[PDB]
From a paper:
The archaeal GTPase factor aEF1A (eEF1A in eukaryotes, EF-Tu in bacteria) delivers aminoacyl-tRNA to the ribosome in its GTP-bound form. After codon recognition by the aminoacyl-tRNA and GTP hydrolysis, aEF1A is then released from the ribosome in its GDP-bound form. aEF1A also delivers aRF1 and aPelota in translation termination and mRNA surveillance pathways, respectively. The ribosomal protein called the “stalk” which is in the ribosomal large subunit plays a crucial role in efficient action of translational GTPases3,6–8. In archaea, the ribosomal stalk protein, aP1, and its anchor protein aP0 form a heptameric complex aP0•(aP1)2•(aP1)2•(aP1).
The results of these efforts were a crystal of the A. pernix tetrameric complex ApeP1C17•ApeEF1A•GTP•ApePelota that diffracted to 3.0 Å resolution. A part of the ApeP1C17 peptide (S103 to F111) was observed in a hydrophobic space between domains 1 and 3 in an extended unstructured form. This P1 binding site was ~25 Å away from the GTP/GDP-binding site in domain 1. The structure of the ApeP1C17•ApeEF1A•GTP•ApePelota complex revealed that the three hydrophobic amino acids, M108, F109, and F111 of ApeP1 make contact with several amino acid residues of ApeEF1A in the complex. Thus, M108 binds to R140 in domain 1 of ApeEF1A via van der Waals interaction; F109 binds to R329, F331, I421, and I423 in domain 3 of ApeEF1A via van der Waals interactions; F111 binds to R140 via hydrogen bonding, and to F401, R409, and I423 in domain 3 of ApeEF1A via van der Waals interactions. Notably, the highly conserved F109 of ApeP1 binds to a hydrophobic pocket that is formed by the hydrophobic amino acids F331, I421, and I423 of ApeEF1A. The conformations of regions including the P-loop and switch I and II elements, which are related to GTP hydrolysis, are also similar in the two structures. These results indicate that aP1 binding has no substantial effect on the overall structure of ApeEF1A including the GTP hydrolysis site in the domain 1. Of these residues, only the conserved M108 and F109 of ApeP1 (L106 and F107 in PhoP1, respectively) are involved in binding of aP1 to both aEF1A•GDP and to aEF1A•GTP. Based on these findings, we infer that aP1 facilitates the formation of the closed conformation of aEF1A•GTP by bridging domains 1 and 3, probably with the aid of aminoacyl-tRNA/aPelota/aRF1, and promotes the selective binding of the closed-conformation aEF1A•GTP•aminoacyl-tRNA/aPelota/aRF1 complex to the factor binding center of the ribosome.
Numbering used by the authors:
A (entry chain B): -1 to 355
B (entry chain A): 4 to 435
C (entry chain X): 103 to 111
Write the structure that this text describes.
């Protein structure tokens, strides 16, 4: 479950932590920043002897230069210039690229101190699982693995099925529902998924559902009504009432209902929302923001002005009891946010456009 | 005898499949021994009155549910014409198949139910009398016959008060879509009992209009877009022994002849056409109108599927890497923005396509550039937008090949909007 | 609703 976070020094500039789930790697991605110095025990090749090298394990302190996280890998990938290490190896000033894993102890220091909000966020990662969602119709089968922080399409097949007039059409759909069910069970195992939601129009999803319950009785299985199969059907299921209850703890899913609420407001009541980093920050100072939906790449934007501005807004909205939802740009909600500068906000009251400083 | 493709559309269980079932049995094409064999099995399951429907409906789900799911193709002929009749699904979950059927149709029979609640459910906001009329219109069906079915029912009983009332509400709605409301026959029929299908019904002497067969012969044949490239959107792909892999589809434009080498886009697979079959008739060529099976040496079952379009190598079908389009937003819960990815239904294809830009908003009743790069579109708006297909899609400009360039936007088990394609940034033609 | 839209249909 949640990350062991433990402030060390008097000034609260140093923190010592150990990620214990993939959500804890995500929390590190949204939290860490170019300038923080991590202290990890890694290995590094060093020239010892004559025309010879040894992989010798050592402790390094690294001024972070790069924080990247690919979902479903169990790897927060970090890089930067080594600011401290053993003096004979001559590594000071050199680039060390490596990967924080689950179980990796790392101490990390921020020059201007860690906030109480930053730590609370860092300790919020109640290790939520990783569901699988699939969608089945007569044309298409897709399957995806869904975390709070990521979605990945693991299968996307066309059921190149006979026309219903064809003999052996009935056995060909049977093979196809086996191939589908098999693949669901395969990936629920490979990802340790408790729930497996199965979308689609009509009975194919139930035929597939029965096959997976047979092969995994411990696994929970939800059948959701949906207009079509494939990746569209998976993405359709994410917006249904059924799935928002069953997977209510997943940002990715959470995001779609605020996005829907934000867009329902942009039509009628334009002044009860804001978007774009600066306008969000403006209304955040006012204490206007109820929830803020954010693309995670804004936290790491190469422009210093917007990383400080986005952090200020996020810090402000949570200082006045607002919610902050951070998601990958590579996701069905994330894709709609590009035209709004990566950020959207729901406001508690109308704020006129000429009042937004 | 000229050939025409007839599609059957209407709300769930308004009686499409029984109409086509019984209409064939009266015109001669269904065997007595078969019809009663279906009646027995129908009766053996809790499905007594689906005997005529089971001529068309065949799948495990279709028979269990008593629901048409995918298109059933059948053949008959009247005095003047020979028909490919295409029984399409009513249920909302399968309107994507209704669209593939509608894209092939030269005309349509709109089966509406005169029963209480059923007409109203058909014509409500989220009904399919309404939606299939919308979709049929946008896919190019200009000719239309309407069959006010279920006249015999206990809660109607051959009533004129109902017939006049249901025709009134349809006439108001169809004239919005821009149909020739005085020029189309509204036939009060019973698909189950067989009234007005072939011979006049004694039970409706007040009628004085054409019967279904007499209305079929009323229909004029379509024009033939020959002197255009070859376009055959595939419907299905079979592996029939004695032939190999045989795609089936309607020819929209051009002329397919035996021996022609053909390419299937988007896959880029090339195949020699070995034979052409239509209603089990050997053809040496097919032309606009013809719904044919055509064997192909070289291509396998795994290489091609529904939504793929066949053409000559001379000018293969355009694979849209991106495409521009004018659209009109019918319904949307919130608001359409850059990033939105509804399913684009063109010809036989149904492919998600991301809106990568909204170039301009337009006035729905006139259509001039009101705004430029608007932040959103909502229900009632019309606009110019740029799509990027999530997977390879074949589209063509509406000016060039209108039947490959007219489309519906669907999302969330609803029709969001409709549109035509005004430009296409083509993809890299990647032949094997 | 208001649906009187022709694209040359
Ligand atoms: N009384 C009466 N019942 C009818 C008539 N036509 C159809 N039905 C009944 O309506 C039900 C459905 O008939 P279908 O022909 O399957 O309807 P459908 O529109 O083809 O169904 P979908 O294609 O799935 O929408 C059956 O129980 C039929 O007995 C009719 O003319 N009169
Ligand atoms: Mg039917
Ligand atoms: Na039916």
């Amino acid at each position: 479950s949640h990350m062991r976070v433990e402030v060390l020094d008097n000034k609260r500039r140093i923190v010592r932590l150990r990620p214990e789930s993939e959500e804890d790697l995500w929390l590190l991605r949204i939290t860490l920043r170019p300038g923080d110095v991590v202290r990890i025990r890694t290995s590094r090749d060093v020239p010892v002897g004559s025309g010879r090298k040894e992989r010798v394990v050592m402790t390094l302190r690294i001024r972070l230069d790069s924080i990247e996280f690919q979902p479903f890998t169990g790897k927060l990938r970090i890089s930067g210039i080594v600011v401290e290490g053993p003096d004979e190896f001559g590594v000071k000033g050199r680039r060390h690229s490596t990967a924080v894993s689950i179980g990796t102890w790392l101490v990390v220091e921020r020059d201007k101190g860690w906030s109480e909000q930053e730590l609370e966020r860092l300790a919020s990662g109640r290790a939520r699982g990783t569901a699988v969602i699939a969608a089945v119709d007569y044309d298409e089968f897709a399957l995806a693995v869904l975390a709070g922080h990521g979605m990945k399409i693991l299968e996307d097949t066309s059921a190149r099925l006979p026309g219903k007039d064809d003999p052996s059409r009935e056995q060909e759909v049977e093979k196809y529902v086996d191939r589908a069910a098999k693949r669901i069970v395969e990936e629920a195992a490979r990802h340790r998924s408790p729930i497996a939601v199965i979308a689609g129009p009509g009975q194919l999803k139930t035929s597939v559902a029965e096959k997976v319950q047979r092969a995994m009785p411990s696994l929970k299985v939800a059948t959701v009504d949906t207009s079509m199969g494939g990746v569209a059907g998976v993405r359709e299921a994410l917006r249904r009432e059924s799935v928002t209850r069953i997977l209510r703890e997943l940002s990715i899913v959470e995001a779609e209902g605020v996005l829907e609420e934000f867009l329902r407001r942009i039509a009628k009541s334009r002044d009860t929302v804001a978007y774009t980093p600066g306008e969000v920050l403006a209304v955040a100072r006012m204490g206007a923001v109820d929830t803020v939906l954010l693309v995670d790449t804004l936290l790491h934007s190469p422009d210093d002005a917007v990383r400080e501005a986005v952090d200020e807004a996020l810090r402000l909205v949570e200082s006045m009891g607002g919610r902050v939802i951070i998601i990958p740009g590579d996701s069905p909600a994330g894709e709609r946010l590009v035209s709004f500068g990566g950020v959207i906000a729901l406001l508690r009251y109308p704020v006129p456009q000429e009042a937004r400083r | 005898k000229p050939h025409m493709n007839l599609v059957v559309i209407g709300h769930v269980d308004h009686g499409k499949s029984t109409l086509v079932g019984h209409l064939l049995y009266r015109l001669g094409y269904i065997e007595e021994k078969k019809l009663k064999e279906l009646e027995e099995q129908a009766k053996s399951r809790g499905k007594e009155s689906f005997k005529f429907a089971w001529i068309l409906d065949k799948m495990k789900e279709e028979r269990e549910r008593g629901i048409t799911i995918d298109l059933t193709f059948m053949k008959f002929e009247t005095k003047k014409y020979v028909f490919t009749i295409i029984d399409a699904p009513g249920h909302r979950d399968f309107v994507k198949n209704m669209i593939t059927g509608a894209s092939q149709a030269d005309a349509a029979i709109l089966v509406v139910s005169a029963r209480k609640g059923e007409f109203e459910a058909g014509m409500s906001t989220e009904g399919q009398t309404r939606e299939h009329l919308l979709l049929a219109r946008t896919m190019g069906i200009e000719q239309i016959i309407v069959a006010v079915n279920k006249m015999d029912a206990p809660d109607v009983n051959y009533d004129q008060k109902r017939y006049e009332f249901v025709v009134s509400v349809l006439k108001k709605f169809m004239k919005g879509l821009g149909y020739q409301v005085d020029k189309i026959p509204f036939i009060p029929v019973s698909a189950w009992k067989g009234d007005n299908l072939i011979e006049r019904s004694p039970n409706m002497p007040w009628y004085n209009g054409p019967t279904l067969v007499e209305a079929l012969d009323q229909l004029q044949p379509p024009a033939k877009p020959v002197d255009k490239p070859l376009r055959i959107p595939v419907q299905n792909v079979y592996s029939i022994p004695g032939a190999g892999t045989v795609p089936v589809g309607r020819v929209e434009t051009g002329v397919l002849r035996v021996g022609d080498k053909v390419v299937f886009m988007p896959p880029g697979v090339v195949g020699e056409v070995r034979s052409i079959e239509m209603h089990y008739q050997q053809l040496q060529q097919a032309e606009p109108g013809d719904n044919i099976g055509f064997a192909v040496r070289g291509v396998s079952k795994s290489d091609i599927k529904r939504g793929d379009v066949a053409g000559h190598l001379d000018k293969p079908p355009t694979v849209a890497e991106e495409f521009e389009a004018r659209i009109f937003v019918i319904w949307h819960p919130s608001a359409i923005t850059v990033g939105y990815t509804p399913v684009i239904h063109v010809h036989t294809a149904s492919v998600s396509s991301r809106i990568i830009e909204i170039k301009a908003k337009l006035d729905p009743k006139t259509g001039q550039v009101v705004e430029q790069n608007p932040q959103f579109l909502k229900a009632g708006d019309a606009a110019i937008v740029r799509f990027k297909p999530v997977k390879p899609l074949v589209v063509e400009k509406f000016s060039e090949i209108p039947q490959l360039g007219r489309f519906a936007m669907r999302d969330m088990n609803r029709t969001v909007g409709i549109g035509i394609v005004t430009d296409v940034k083509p993809a890299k033609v990647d032949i094997k | 609703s208001g649906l009187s839209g022709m694209f040359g249909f």
